[PDB]
Design a binder for this molecule. Structure first.
Ligand SMILES: O=C(CCCc1ccccc1)N1CCOCC1
Ligand SMILES: O=C(CCCc1ccccc1)N1CCOCC1
Lengths: 265, 266
């Protein structure tokens, strides 16, 4: 992979692997999520991150995901090449946004798009805080100055508020616990695992007859290595809409909330 | 990736991804296992197997390849961002079955950083029964294997061919209630063979993982874990640190896997 001519975005090509595809022989939404994750880490390395700025390291601040939104039109098939272009943008004092554009390396057509909202958090106390002006100037030089949105639209799904699932849920998957493969290099649960846990409560018949088109996911708290999760789902709706909730199996502490949209094959 | 000059082995280069590494920033044994799995599929496609891996007789007989044993020995785990080259090849073991070997190398230095060997057997995809490789079903794949023996683990009396005992109750360490999610399944809805590796390692205490690097792992496959099954992972220290492992269904205690791991201090 490499940064583009202006140095304000990053591109990378990926050949789809055998173990990365589902029953329909096309990459899963978790493979896509993992691919988005890798091109973002590679874009941070290429711009000089050893990911913390000089002021973030001095103040023990880190980037944390607050929301992830993914919309897929076509899932790349096993053996195909998918090109991903990623870029970042300052959202003033709120935080940062990272966008992605998925393209077929052969046709050049857009096959998916994703957007994420990252916020500042003290690595030690776990407390969120606004982006300080000193930190902003250190990363602004790596972002396009003019707005460049993957989801530009007037009333797009990526900026819609998500409600809290009410008990009783229609469908549920209980006792979900992470294993060492679900952890990252700093021993925290990888953000993609929560996507897989949300989808576990979707009945298999829906997965067999529908393709996942849109997924919005809000991150409220992290799941510790020794935590047990409950995944809940209720149909809210040709298209099938769902409302999801991830909560700790014991106290019912909310970990995640989101929505999925599915279309018939 | 591509087949070598003779067409009797296959090579592929892999750049190590951020999410593929563990706490020490080097690829995990499951990332390596997944990499071995992909280069074997790519070697089968390049030699003429359709993406619908069976020969012309296996189709009209409903026979499929199943893993009976996996053995992996790693000297150095590739770091995040590094390039690892894998050379893979197959060999007929007469009517017992087939063997697939792998050699891992540093794309920069060229030195061997790991090696693995697997034993595959014939199985009716409907009745799950075990069969010997028939003569007609051998001549069809023998043309893709080197005729002379080429072993990744040649040494007489080596770890890859040692019999594994059954763990006796009570186990020293245990991880219970392990169930697969959709990410653990393959394209044909079966549990991917790498998931069982991760489940075996779940019973290893975290302090051992933090102070040691996994050097050798031998794993025998006895039964598949269905999508709706619950697994128990058991471990007992037998000793470098050596362990004996056992995977069994949470309910009836039906054995699904057994194996060993060998670990070195960092
Ligand atoms: O996307 C982010 C946050 C912003 C980092 C950034 C990179 C390049 C230009 C401008 C800003 N991260 C990369 C990997 O995930 C953790 C941090
Ligand atoms: O290796 C095998 C079975 C033998 C297939 C083979 C490929 C190339 C040369 C000779 C034989 N498998 C790996 C791919 O998935 C199915 C099992």
């Amino acid at each position: 992979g490499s940064l583009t001519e202006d140095g304000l975005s990053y591109k990378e090509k990926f050949v789809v692997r055998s173990y990365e595809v589902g029953s329909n022989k096309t990459a899963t939404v978790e493979t896509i999520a993992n691919l988005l994750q890798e091109v973002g880490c590679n874009h941070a390395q290429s711009v000089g991150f050893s990911a913390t700025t000089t002021t973030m390291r001095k103040l023990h601040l880190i980037w944390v995901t607050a929301r992830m939104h993914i919309e897929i039109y076509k899932y790349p098939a096993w053996g195909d090449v998918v090109e991903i272009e990623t870029w970042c943008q300052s959202e003033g004092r709120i935080g940062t946004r990272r966008d992605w554009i998925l393209k077929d390396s052969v046709t050049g057509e857009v096959t998916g798009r994703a957007t994420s909202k990252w916020v500042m958090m003290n690595q030690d106390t776990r407390r969120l805080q606004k982006v300080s002006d000193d930190v902003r100037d250190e990363y602004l030089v790596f972002c396009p100055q003019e707005p460049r949105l993957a989801f530009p639209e007037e009333n797009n799904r990526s900026l819609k508020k998500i409600p809290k699932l009410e008990d009783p849920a229609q469908y549920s998957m209980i006792g979900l616990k992470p294993r060492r493969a679900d952890l990252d290099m700093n021993q925290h649960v990888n953000n993609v695992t929560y996507i897989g846990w949300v989808l576990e409560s979707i009945p298999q018949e829906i997965v067999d007859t529908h393709e996942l088109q849109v997924i919005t996911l809000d991150y409220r708290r992290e799941c510790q290595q020794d935590d047990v999760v409950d995944s809940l789902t209720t149909t809210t709706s040709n298209d099938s809409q769902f409302l999801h909730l991830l909560r700790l199996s014991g106290d019912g502490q909310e970990i995640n909330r989101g929505t999925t949209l599915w279309r018939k094959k």
